[PDB]
Ligand binder design. Sequence first.
Ligand code: HEC
Length: 93
Amino acid sequence: ADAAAGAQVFAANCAACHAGGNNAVMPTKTLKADALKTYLAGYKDGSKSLEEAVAYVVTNGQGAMPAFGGRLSDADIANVAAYIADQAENNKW
Ligand code: HEC
């Protein structure tokens, strides 16, 4: 999906909890490449791509993280997932 478009999604929906690609609530579970491969469901076990796994967690929530399905458009979810994947894989946080 569109990483560049996802940056704005992120700014509007995700930065209060994940500023800097970090995690204010659960500090180990950051959006950096190493943490994502350790902790993010689906991605960590090899059964999902990073982008899909981010799309899933955004849509459905996890633990303390709210769900965004029904709050964000399908494109917005897809694009923010692409932004996370791009930031992480390219070490841009
Ligand atoms: C605070 C109220 C949050 C908001 C808003 C968003 N996220 Fe979040 N996220 C939060 C927590 C507490 C966690 C940990 C969940 C757990 O495993 O217990 C997460 C996790 C993620 C992850 C996985 C990180 C990892 O496992 O290392 C991703 C990819 C993620 N969050 C992305 C994300 C996006 C893109 C958001 C805006 C749409 C967003 N989160 C909101 C807390 C909060």
